[PDB]
Write a protein that holds these residues in place. Structure first.
Motif, PDB file in Angstrom:
ATOM      1  N   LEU A 189       0.817  -1.208   0.000  1.00  7.88           N
ATOM      2  CA  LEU A 189       0.000   0.000   0.000  1.00  7.88           C
ATOM      3  C   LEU A 189       0.853   1.261   0.000  1.00  7.88           C
ATOM      4  O   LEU A 189       0.390   2.319  -0.437  1.00  7.88           O
ATOM      5  CB  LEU A 189      -0.941  -0.005   1.204  1.00  7.88           C
ATOM      6  CG  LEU A 189      -1.919  -1.177   1.289  1.00  7.88           C
ATOM      7  CD1 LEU A 189      -1.548  -2.095   2.441  1.00  7.88           C
ATOM      8  CD2 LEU A 189      -3.342  -0.674   1.440  1.00  7.88           C
ATOM      9  N   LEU A 209      -7.486   4.942  -2.054  1.00  4.41           N
ATOM     10  CA  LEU A 209      -6.525   3.867  -2.247  1.00  4.41           C
ATOM     11  C   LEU A 209      -6.956   2.906  -3.344  1.00  4.41           C
ATOM     12  O   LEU A 209      -6.106   2.419  -4.090  1.00  4.41           O
ATOM     13  CB  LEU A 209      -6.309   3.106  -0.940  1.00  4.41           C
ATOM     14  CG  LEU A 209      -5.456   3.795   0.125  1.00  4.41           C
ATOM     15  CD1 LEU A 209      -5.544   3.043   1.438  1.00  4.41           C
ATOM     16  CD2 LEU A 209      -4.012   3.906  -0.332  1.00  4.41           C
ATOM     17  N   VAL A 222       0.560   5.299  -2.472  1.00  2.00           N
ATOM     18  CA  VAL A 222       0.315   6.628  -1.922  1.00  2.00           C
ATOM     19  C   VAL A 222       0.693   7.743  -2.883  1.00  2.00           C
ATOM     20  O   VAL A 222       0.052   8.800  -2.875  1.00  2.00           O
ATOM     21  CB  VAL A 222       1.069   6.800  -0.589  1.00  2.00           C
ATOM     22  CG1 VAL A 222       0.704   8.121   0.068  1.00  2.00           C
ATOM     23  CG2 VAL A 222       0.762   5.642   0.341  1.00  2.00           C
ATOM     24  N   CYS A 244      -9.688  -2.753  -1.944  1.00  2.00           N
ATOM     25  CA  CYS A 244      -8.986  -2.322  -0.739  1.00  2.00           C
ATOM     26  C   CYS A 244      -9.793  -2.819   0.459  1.00  2.00           C
ATOM     27  O   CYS A 244     -10.693  -2.133   0.945  1.00  2.00           O
ATOM     28  CB  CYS A 244      -8.813  -0.808  -0.722  1.00  2.00           C
ATOM     29  SG  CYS A 244      -7.457  -0.230   0.309  1.00  2.00           S
ATOM     30  N   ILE A 250      -2.317   8.658  -5.377  1.00  4.99           N
ATOM     31  CA  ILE A 250      -3.628   9.037  -4.863  1.00  4.99           C
ATOM     32  C   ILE A 250      -4.058  10.367  -5.466  1.00  4.99           C
ATOM     33  O   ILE A 250      -3.312  11.352  -5.428  1.00  4.99           O
ATOM     34  CB  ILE A 250      -3.619   9.106  -3.326  1.00  4.99           C
ATOM     35  CG1 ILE A 250      -3.535   7.702  -2.734  1.00  4.99           C
ATOM     36  CG2 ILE A 250      -4.858   9.809  -2.817  1.00  4.99           C
ATOM     37  CD1 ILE A 250      -3.450   7.684  -1.229  1.00  4.99           C
TER      38      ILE A 250
END
Length: 338
Positions: free
Chosen positions: A39, A206, A43, A177, A46
């Motif tokens: 994950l 996400l 980032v 997610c 996003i």
């Protein structure tokens, strides 16, 4: 006004397949699953613009959008507070490994016959074998401007046809997610509305970032049809890349029943645990899916209103009654139903 289907097909997006660069065969046939996708890598992808609209934080011109929103004195302090708290909670969630990303991607040969896009097995010759799945496209039918040069697009116009002998390919993806559903309940049982809203907004962000990152990986390393591309995210969000990833239910193919074919073919249920409900909506809500089109000239379009002749032709093609096509294609019908 709507053109007849027999005439709207003639004015379709014709391409000269015998001179255009022949499609690249992807690195594998079948599916590949991503179980515990990192994950932290997502980032940087996003898109924060839809995140601010969850709290209805809108800035005026010229600060009307991320990251200009931090300057507008009306919301800038609150936008900064929300963004910083979002980053804090995102760091805590990734560090604690609460949320767990999950996805699947696959590729199959594809050959278009009229408005359909028939997929075939790996070793089966397309001209002498049955397909394994079909994605019944819908053609634009609404009459365009008199001076318009645009063709009447269909999603099958982006796949080389069966008779031309050239082999084309198609891919599909599904990402999710997981873990947001439990954390929202946790933050609501202990009386925390801010965290409950923020965790769901972050889960949606996400999921979208995972979709973008997976498409960028597909275009360059899994399909490798853009191996010379080195675009940055500020360009990826601007659709400067080539190829599209349309999703069922969206104006390219407003038929929501197409997701059943994808789930049946890619085995998304057993591979990732993303389900389709009785309304044909992905569960969990932070899930994205779509089909990969690798053509240079492929572009997003809206089917718009369609006439009854196309509705009955679609019903005949899909081998279902008209009374069901009128149901699943309700919002786009261009004729009185009752």
């Amino acid at each position: 006004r709507y053109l007849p289907l027999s005439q709207a097909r003639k004015s379709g997006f014709q391409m000269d397949w015998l001179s255009e660069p022949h499609p690249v065969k992807p690195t594998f046939i079948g599916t590949q699953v991503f179980e515990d996708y990192d994950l932290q890598k997502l980032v940087d992808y996003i898109d924060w613009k839809p995140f601010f609209d969850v709290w209805q934080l809108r800035g005026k011109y010229p600060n009307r959008g991320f990251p200009k929103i931090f300057n507008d004195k009306t919301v800038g302090g609150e936008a900064r507070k929300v963004y910083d708290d979002a980053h804090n909670m995102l760091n805590t969630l990734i560090s604690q490994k609460k949320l767990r990303a999950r996805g699947v991607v696959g590729f199959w040969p594809a050959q278009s016959i009229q408005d359909d896009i028939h997929l075939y097995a790996e070793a089966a010759v397309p001209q002498a074998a049955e397909p394994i799945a079909t994605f019944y496209g819908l053609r634009q039918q609404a009459e365009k401007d008199s001076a318009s040069t645009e063709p009447y697009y269909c999603l099958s116009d982006f796949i080389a046809p069966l008779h031309s002998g050239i082999r084309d390919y198609l891919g599909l993806f599904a990402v999710a997610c997981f873990g947001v559903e439990e954390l929202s309940k946790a933050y609501e049982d202990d009386g925390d509305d801010y965290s409950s809203i923020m965790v769901k907004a972050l889960g949606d962000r996400l999921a979208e970032a995972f979709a973008e990152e997976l498409h960028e990986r597909v275009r360059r390393e899994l399909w490798a049809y853009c191996g010379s591309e080195q675009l940055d995210v500020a360009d990826l969000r601007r659709l400067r890349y080539k190829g599209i990833r349309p999703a069922p239910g969206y104006p390219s193919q407003p038929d929501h029943t197409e997701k059943l074919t994808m789930w049946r073919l890619a085995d998304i249920e057993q591979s990732t645990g993303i389900r389709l409900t009785e309304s044909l909506a992905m569960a969990p809500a932070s899930a994205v899916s779509g089909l990969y089109f690798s053509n240079l000239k492929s572009k997003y379009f809206a089917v718009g209103k369609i006439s009854k002749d196309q509705v009955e032709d679609y019903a005949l093609r899909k081998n279902i009654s008209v009374a069901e096509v009128e149901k699943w294609l309700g919002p786009i019908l261009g004729y009185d139903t009752d």
